[PDB]
Amino acid sequence: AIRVTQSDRDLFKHLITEATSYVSADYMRHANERRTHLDEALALRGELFG
Amino acid sequence: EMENVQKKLRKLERDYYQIREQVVSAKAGWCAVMRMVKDNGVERRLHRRE
Amino acid sequence: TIEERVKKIIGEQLGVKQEEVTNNASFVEDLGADSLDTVELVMALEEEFDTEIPDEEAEKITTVQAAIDYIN
Amino acid sequence: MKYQQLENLECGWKWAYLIRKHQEGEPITKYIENSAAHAAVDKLIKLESEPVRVLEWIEQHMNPDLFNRMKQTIRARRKRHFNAEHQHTRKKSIDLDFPVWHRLSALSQRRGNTLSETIVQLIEDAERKEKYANQ
Amino acid sequence: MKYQQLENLECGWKWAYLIRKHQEGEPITKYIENSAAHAAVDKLIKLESEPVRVLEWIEQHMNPDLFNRMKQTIRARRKRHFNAEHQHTRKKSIDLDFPVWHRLSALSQRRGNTLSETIVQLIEDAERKEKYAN
DNA sequence: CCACTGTTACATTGTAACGGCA
DNA sequence: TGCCGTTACAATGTAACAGTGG
Ligand SMILES: *P(=O)(O)OCC(C)(C)[C@@H](O)C(=O)NCCC(=O)NCCS
Known part of the structure; x- marks a missing residue:
C-alpha cells in the first residue's frame, strides 16, 4: 500500500508540475507579444490617419 | 507628385492592415482559450505572473 | 447579417455570452471590456466590414447599440 | 543563427x-x-x-x-x-500552367529577382496604372 | 468523360x-x-x-x-x-509570400479570372506598357 | 577553407469547392 | 443527383544558391 500510494503521489506531482510548466510559459509569451504588437499598431494607425 | 506620395500612403496602409489583422487574430484566440478554460485552471495555475 | 455579425464579433472579441450581448449592453460595464479590450473590439469591428473609423467618432462608440448605429 | x-x-x-x-x-x-x-x-x-x-x-x-x-x-x-x-x-503554395510559369520564370531570370519579387513588380505596375486612373 | x-x-x-x-x-x-x-x-x-x-x-x-x-x-x-x-x-507549383499571394488573389477574385489567367493578363499588360514606352 | 543556416523553387500527394453534363 | 474535370490550396521533402562565423 505504501509503495502504491507513493508512486501515485509522485506521478500526480510530476504530471501537474510539468504540465503547468509546459503551458503557462507559452501562454505568458503569447500575452507579451500580443501587448507588444498592439503597442506597435497604434502608432502606425495614428500616422496613417493624417 | 500626389500619386507618388499616395503610393507610400498605400504601403503604410498595407502595413497597418497586416498588423491590425494579426492583433485581432491574437485577441480572438486568447478569448477562445479563456472561454475553453472555464474549468477554473486559469486563475492562478495558468496565469503564473512570475 | 450586420446586426448579428456585430454580436459575433463582440462575443468572440470579449468572450461574453451571446445572450449577454443585447443592443443596449455597454461594453465596459455590462461586457466588462476595458481600455485595451475595447480597442481590440473596435479593431475587429473595423476588420470585419473592411472599413475605417475616425478616432473621436470611434471612441464615441461605447455600447452595442452605438456600435451597430455607426456600423449600419 | x-x-x-x-x-x-x-x-x-x-x-x-x-x-x-x-x-x-x-x-x-x-x-x-x-x-x-x-x-x-x-x-x-x-x-x-x-x-x-x-x-x-x-x-x-x-x-x-x-x-x-x-x-x-x-x-x-x-x-x-x-x-x-x-x-x-507564412508562405502560400500555388500551381501554374507550364506556359505561364515558363514566361514568368524567364522574366524573373531576366530581372534577376525571385518569383515573389517579380510578381510584386508586376502587380505594382498594374496598381500604378489603377492609381493614376483613380487619382 | x-x-x-x-x-x-x-x-x-x-x-x-x-x-x-x-x-x-x-x-x-x-x-x-x-x-x-x-x-x-x-x-x-x-x-x-x-x-x-x-x-x-x-x-x-x-x-x-x-x-x-x-x-x-x-x-x-x-x-x-x-x-x-x-x-x-504539366503544372508548375511555386510558393508565394503571403502579402503577394493576398494581392494576387484579390485581383483574381475581383476580375473573375484564375491565377494563371490573371498572371497571363498582367504580364501581357506589362509587355504592352513596355512597347508603349518603347 | 569549411561547416552550418536561411531562402527559393520546385515536386509529390491529398482535399474541398465549383461547375459541366447524363 | 452523382460522376468527372478543374482549381487552389496544405504539408512535407530536396536541390540549389547565398550568407555567416569559426
Ligand atoms: P487603456 O486604459 O489601456 O487605454 C489604451 C489607450 C486608449 C490609451 C490606447 O488604446 C490608445 O488609444 N493609445 C493612443 C492614444 C492616441 O490617441 N494617440 C495618438 C496617436 S499615436
Whole structure:
C-alpha cells in the first residue's frame, strides 16, 4: 500500500508540475507579444490617419 | 507628385492592415482559450505572473 | 447579417455570452471590456466590414447599440 | 543563427523523419546484413519516447547517405515552424500552367529577382496604372 | 468523360491509397470491433496484385465516410497521370509570400479570372506598357 | 577553407469547392 | 443527383544558391 500510494503521489506531482510548466510559459509569451504588437499598431494607425 | 506620395500612403496602409489583422487574430484566440478554460485552471495555475 | 455579425464579433472579441450581448449592453460595464479590450473590439469591428473609423467618432462608440448605429 | 534551436523538438522531428523513411522502405541503417539492420530499427522504435537518445542512434546506425537530406529537411521544418506563427511570414503554395510559369520564370531570370519579387513588380505596375486612373 | 480509366492501374492506385491510409492510422473499415477491422485489413494486405477483388473488397468493407475522399483522390491522380505526359500540360507549383499571394488573389477574385489567367493578363499588360514606352 | 543556416523553387500527394453534363 | 474535370490550396521533402562565423 505504501509503495502504491507513493508512486501515485509522485506521478500526480510530476504530471501537474510539468504540465503547468509546459503551458503557462507559452501562454505568458503569447500575452507579451500580443501587448507588444498592439503597442506597435497604434502608432502606425495614428500616422496613417493624417 | 500626389500619386507618388499616395503610393507610400498605400504601403503604410498595407502595413497597418497586416498588423491590425494579426492583433485581432491574437485577441480572438486568447478569448477562445479563456472561454475553453472555464474549468477554473486559469486563475492562478495558468496565469503564473512570475 | 450586420446586426448579428456585430454580436459575433463582440462575443468572440470579449468572450461574453451571446445572450449577454443585447443592443443596449455597454461594453465596459455590462461586457466588462476595458481600455485595451475595447480597442481590440473596435479593431475587429473595423476588420470585419473592411472599413475605417475616425478616432473621436470611434471612441464615441461605447455600447452595442452605438456600435451597430455607426456600423449600419 | 537566426532561429532558436530547440533540442527536444528537433530530436522528435528527427525521430519522426527516420521512422517515416523506414516505413517508406528506404534503408536508413548503414548495415547491409538483415539482422543487424532489423535490430537497429527495433531499437530506434523503442526510442520513440526518448528523443535524446535518437542523436546517438543516428551516430551509431544512420545510413551515411542521409546526412545531407536530414540536415536539409529539419532545417526547412524549423524555418516553416517558426514562420507559421504569423500570417505575414507564412508562405502560400500555388500551381501554374507550364506556359505561364515558363514566361514568368524567364522574366524573373531576366530581372534577376525571385518569383515573389517579380510578381510584386508586376502587380505594382498594374496598381500604378489603377492609381493614376483613380487619382 | 475525358480521360479513359484503366482498371489494372486505378485499382493499384486504390490499393496503395488504402494501405497508406491504414499505415497512417485512418480507420479503413466500417467495423468498430478491432478484430473484424484487423481481419479485413489483413485480407486487403494479402489482396495485393488484384484489381477485380480489391474493387469488391472496397464495396464490402470500405468505411462509408472515406468514399468521397477516395473518389476525388483517384480523380486527381488520373488527371495528373494523363497530364504528366507532355510538358505543356504539366503544372508548375511555386510558393508565394503571403502579402503577394493576398494581392494576387484579390485581383483574381475581383476580375473573375484564375491565377494563371490573371498572371497571363498582367504580364501581357506589362509587355504592352513596355512597347508603349518603347 | 569549411561547416552550418536561411531562402527559393520546385515536386509529390491529398482535399474541398465549383461547375459541366447524363 | 452523382460522376468527372478543374482549381487552389496544405504539408512535407530536396536541390540549389547565398550568407555567416569559426
Ligand atoms: P487603456 O486604459 O489601456 O487605454 C489604451 C489607450 C486608449 C490609451 C490606447 O488604446 C490608445 O488609444 N493609445 C493612443 C492614444 C492616441 O490617441 N494617440 C495618438 C496617436 S499615436
